[PDB]
Amino acid sequence: NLNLPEQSTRFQTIASIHSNNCSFEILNNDPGYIYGDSVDGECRIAVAHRELGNGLERTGDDRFLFIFYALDNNNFIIANRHDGFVLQFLIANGQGVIVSREYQPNIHQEFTIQSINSDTFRLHSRDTNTFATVCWAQFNSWTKIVSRVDNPGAPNANLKHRSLLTDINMPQLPSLTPLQPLPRLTELEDGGLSPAQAPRAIIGRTLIPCLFVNDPVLRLENRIKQSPYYVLEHRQYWHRIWTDIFTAGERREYREVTGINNNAQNDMNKMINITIGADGPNRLRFGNLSTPFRQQIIDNSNTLGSFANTNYGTRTDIVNVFNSEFHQVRYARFVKAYEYRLTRADGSQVGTPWVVLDRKEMDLRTYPHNMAITLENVKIDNADNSYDLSIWKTPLKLKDGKIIIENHENSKPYYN
Amino acid sequence: NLNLPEQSTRFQTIASIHSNNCSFEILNNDPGYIYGDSVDGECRIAVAHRELGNGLERTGDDRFLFIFYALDNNNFIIANRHDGFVLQFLIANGQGVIVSREYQPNIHQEFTIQSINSDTFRLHSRDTNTFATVCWAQFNSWTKIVSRVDNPGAPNANLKHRSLLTDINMPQLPSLTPLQPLPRLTELEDGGLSPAQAPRAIIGRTLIPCLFVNDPVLRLENRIKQSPYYVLEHRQYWHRIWTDIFTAGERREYREVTGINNNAQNDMNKMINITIGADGPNRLRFGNLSTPFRQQIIDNSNTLGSFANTNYGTRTDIVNVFNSEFHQVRYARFVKAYEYRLTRADGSQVGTPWVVLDRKEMDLRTYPHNMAITLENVKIDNADNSYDLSIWKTPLKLKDGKIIIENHENSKPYYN
């Protein structure tokens, strides 16, 4: 069940309904460029870099093919298959024109579709109250695409899709799967599942427009052809932080590193213009590039918006544990991990996944079964920030198979 | 499976972290009202209708309890449990104050949560760049709530939630279920399932804030207590438009009324500020009240945004059918129906469901099995608008059990 309009899952040409054979064409022209077919005046001379032409449509020419990326506000960013640049309204020399520019974004790159009937639409620039059509209604002539206000005798702005491309390398989305509890340990030598072995649950997944994915290998002009969307997965797994055999009454100390490293956050920001906020492992902060899509990203990834002005960082806790059983016992300690993975349309991974270890949700496995270790003491060794400086209230009994989640009753500030 | 911030699924009080016992309190005061505890000046006299007080928190008093409705842009509308009015920034006599007003909406009713740490936040009015706090930092005094720009002298604007109400009558969302094909007919006397009897598939469901649900029986002050969210269901079913026994070679004429009537659309608009656009039975148009929540509504209801400037209307087709079998045959003809149903948190239905009959997706049941009727001719008798004036290419064989969906090959404009 994909909740996207048909314009967002294909490429299409755009043509005046009054043109026999012409469609909107991406040009790399400069001011002063001459449209040879045009009558003299403002329709004959280019006034801006990268105007659009009323060009004789060539089948399989990427300069005529556009994909409509759906914004949360029901407007579209319209990208071409030739170089991945987007349409933009522009005034140059007092003429309203359509040009192609790199995705910024800005309000002049947002277009509204107005469907008049089943097969006829208008392309509306809501900020300026203008509609895209062919200069001076020269519908069968080589000339520029303009954007003009409704007036008696304004050029007719009724448009259609002349041709479609439906084979566009849409990704095949993974199925959602639930997070299973870890298996019980089978003997003293069983350390449980290491992080590399732990099965991932797929909690959510969303399409991400290629425009703001800084793929280290694929430039924009190749991303728009091979991977017009990327997939962001929200995965969860149980992450083993340590395991050891304890003799009866044995005391041990561990350094537990949780959270997410600053370098991973910087990588995520550079790649997709999203970071994990300090308010939770599933809380997303959006930059200027990803903001226009944020509610779709949240809804489909099964994450929440962050309210923090700080990114999630790392924390090192010193934990003192005591084997309060009079048996030799294998203990394996796990925290919940949130794993964000980005893939291309072909399923290839773009980089190392971004992982947040959540210190607030913890499980234990023992052999023999149903043993309990005592958490005697917790101390913060260091933290990257002061956003969350809660620690466990100790002493705390950790029992085989029992998930513990932080609340107001079992935690306190570190200096109390 | 509920993708909302914790502030959206509970009521909470709002207090300065510097106040021992006081929280934000809804007042029904007028200009010239005296805050008795306040020092003399702008903090002692009310300047607007319905200022907020710094009041000694009373446990279980609805005048202190707020729910945060989450907008698509990550801001909030903040409604109180006493009368369902929302917080708003206002300038009166050159003083920035917080008042309560009916949901409009306007940009001054939108608040940003800025989390400083785990339990501390600021309430930001982004338009004015102001933060809500207690007048002249009189944190333990009866006085008004102001909203002021950050400046060296400015009263500290760090807030917390003093108390929560978690038992708020959240609705229980129904499970999604797929649309089953209709059963086969068992005998000549079997007319198939009538619209009242046909099983509904639940394709989607969404929460709707109570603020803009014009419940005919529950006024706002009672909706916010009993049903702070309503549920909108997107259901589908197979809708029988006619059934008859035909003798061998019998010809009949039916008037088939499809779409949705103007009175149902006006009712839906009055109730929830949504209508069905003419571009499809699952295509929603949003008014001023519902627009700020549109992407959440679309994502959870499994509908699409409409691009039409006209609502879906009715169409009356005259259909001529011919029993081309040399047997007596029972025929039952069905079109796909889209049914939008609104319920309160207690599961009670708010009114008659809104139904769109889709003429473009049609099924047939026969007895005996595997018979085929001939669709000789279709003509449009009348339509409310000119958005869709396609008809079936005739003659067309309709076969038992075969769903037919309109495409470019099996349909034409009505004048061809």
Q: Is the peptide bond before B199 cis (omega within 30 degrees of 0)?
A: no
Give residue limits of the domains in chain B.
9-169, 170-416
Nearest by CB: A304 against B5, B278, B387: B5
A387 and B CB contact within 8 Å: yes
List of chain B residues whose C-beta atoms are within 8 Å of the C-beta of residue A302 = 3
- Dihedral pair phi/psi, residue A270, rounded to 5°: -65, -40
The answer to whether B58 and B21 have CB atoms below 8 angstroms apart is no
Nearest by CB: A296 against B277, B299, B302: B299
Q: How far is the C-alpha of B254 from the C-alpha of B242, rounded, in Å?
A: 8
A370 and B CB contact within 8 Å: no
Nearest by CB: A74 against B303, B305, B389: B305
Q: What is the DSSP letter of A200?
A: P
CA–centroid distance for A195 within its chain: 25
Q: How far is the C-alpha of A196 from the C-alpha of B416, rounded, in Å?
A: 65
List of chain A residues whose C-beta atoms are within 8 Å of the C-beta of residue B279 = 115, 118
List of chain B residues whose C-beta atoms are within 8 Å of the C-beta of residue A115 = 277-279, 306-309, 387
A390 and B CB contact within 8 Å: yes
Q: How far is the C-alpha of A323 from the C-alpha of A375, rounded, in Å?
A: 9
The answer to whether B78 and B52 have CB atoms below 8 angstroms apart is no
The answer to whether A201 and A180 have CB atoms below 8 angstroms apart is yes
Residues 6+ positions from B286 with CB-CB distance below 8 Å: B273, B274, B294, B297, B305
Q: How far is the C-alpha of A321 from the C-alpha of A396, rounded, in Å?
A: 10
E strand or H helix that includes residue A220: helix A220-226
Residue contact A307–B388, C-beta within 8 A: no
- Looking at the complex, report in whole angstroms how far the Cα of residue B307 sits from the nearest Cα belonging to chain A: 5
Residue contact A305–B390, C-beta within 8 A: no
List of chain A residues whose C-beta atoms are within 8 Å of the C-beta of residue B388 = 117-118
Nearest by CB: A115 against B116, B279, B299: B279
Residue B46 tokens, joined:
């009310």
List of chain A residues whose C-beta atoms are within 8 Å of the C-beta of residue B386 = 117
Residue A339 tokens, joined:
């794993």
Q: How far is the C-alpha of A11 from the C-alpha of A6, rounded, in Å?
A: 10
A window 119-138, beta carbon within 8 A of B: 121
Q: How far is the C-alpha of A134 from the C-alpha of A121, rounded, in Å?
A: 15
Sign of CA dihedral B295, B301, B304, B309: negative
Give A274's strand partners: A286
Q: Which amino acid is at B119?
A: D
B window 63-102, beta carbon within 8 A of A: 70, 72-74
Q: Is A60 exposed, middle or buried (0-12, 13-18, 19+ CB in 10 A)?
A: exposed
Nearest by CB: B302 against A3, A70, A118: A3
Nearest by CB: B117 against A116, A300, A386: A386
List of chain B residues whose C-beta atoms are within 8 Å of the C-beta of residue A73 = 72, 294
B286, B240, B292: which is closest to B103 by C-alpha? B292
Q: Give the largest CA-CA distance in chain B.
A: 98
B11, B20, B31, B87: which is closest to B54 by C-alpha? B20
Looking at chain A, how many residues does it have? Answer: 416
Strands in A126-273 per DSSP E: 130-134, 145-148, 159-160, 164-165, 201-209, 229-246, 251-259
The DSSP result for B79-96, as a single string, is EETTT--EEEEEEETTEE
Nearest by CB: B304 against A3, A73, A390: A3
Residue contact B299–A304, C-beta within 8 A: no
Q: How far is the C-alpha of A42 from the C-alpha of A365, rounded, in Å?
A: 77
B127, B79, B90: which is closest to B107 by C-alpha? B127
A406 and B CB contact within 8 Å: no
Residues 6+ positions from B202 with CB-CB distance below 8 Å: B174, B175, B176, B177, B233, B234, B235
Q: Which amino acid is at B286?
A: F
For A14, B239, B308, the CA distances from B356, given in Å and listed in that order, are 31, 10, 16
The DSSP result for B312-359, as a single string, is --EEEEEEEEE--SSS-EEEEEEEEEEEEEEE-TTS-B-SPPEEEEEE
Q: How far is the C-alpha of B74 from the C-alpha of A306, rounded, in Å?
A: 9
* Three-point CA angle B78, B83, B87, nearest 5°: 25
List of chain B residues whose C-beta atoms are within 8 Å of the C-beta of residue A388 = 117-118
A5 and B CB contact within 8 Å: yes
Q: How far is the C-alpha of B42 from the C-alpha of B59, rounded, in Å?
A: 29
Interhelix angle A294-301/B294-301, nearest 10 degrees: 30
Give the mutation candidate from A161, A303, A307 for the B interface (greatest B CB count, under 10 A).
A307
**If you count residue pairs, one on A and one on B, with CB atoms under 8 Å apart, how many are there?**
82
The answer to whether A131 and A150 have CB atoms below 8 angstroms apart is yes
Q: How far is the C-alpha of B117 from the C-alpha of A278, rounded, in Å?
A: 8
B window 268-287, beta carbon within 8 A of A: 277-279
B296 and A CB contact within 8 Å: yes
Q: How far is the C-alpha of A299 from the C-alpha of B340, rounded, in Å?
A: 21
With left for phi above 0 and alpha for psi between -120 and 50, is residue A249 left, alpha or beta?
left
Q: What is the DSSP letter of B156?
A: P
- Looking at the complex, report in whole angstroms how far the Cα of residue A116 sits from the nearest Cα belonging to chain B: 6
- Looking at the complex, report in whole angstroms how far the Cα of residue A133 sits from the nearest Cα belonging to chain B: 18
B236 and A CB contact within 8 Å: no
Residues 6+ positions from B166 with CB-CB distance below 8 Å: B10
Q: How far is the C-alpha of A323 from the C-alpha of A37, rounded, in Å?
A: 89
A117 and B CB contact within 8 Å: yes
- Dihedral pair phi/psi, residue B313, rounded to 5°: -120, -160
Strands in B106-183 per DSSP E: 112-117, 120-125, 130-134, 145-148, 159-160, 164-165
Torsion on CA atoms A121, A127, A128, A134, rounded to nearest 10: -30
The resolution in Å comes to 1.6
List of chain A residues whose C-beta atoms are within 8 Å of the C-beta of residue B122 = none
Give the mutation candidate from B73, B293, B295, B297 for the A interface (greatest A CB count, under 10 A).
B295
A72, A8, A78: which is closest to B299 by C-alpha? A72
Sign of CA dihedral B178, B184, B185, B187: negative
Closest-CA residue of B relative to A112 is: B307
The answer to whether A144 and A43 have CB atoms below 8 angstroms apart is yes
With left for phi above 0 and alpha for psi between -120 and 50, is residue B68 left, alpha or beta?
beta
Q: How far is the C-alpha of A209 from the C-alpha of A203, rounded, in Å?
A: 20
Residue A180 tokens, joined:
């299973």
Residue contact A118–B303, C-beta within 8 A: no
- Dihedral pair phi/psi, residue A69, rounded to 5°: -85, 125
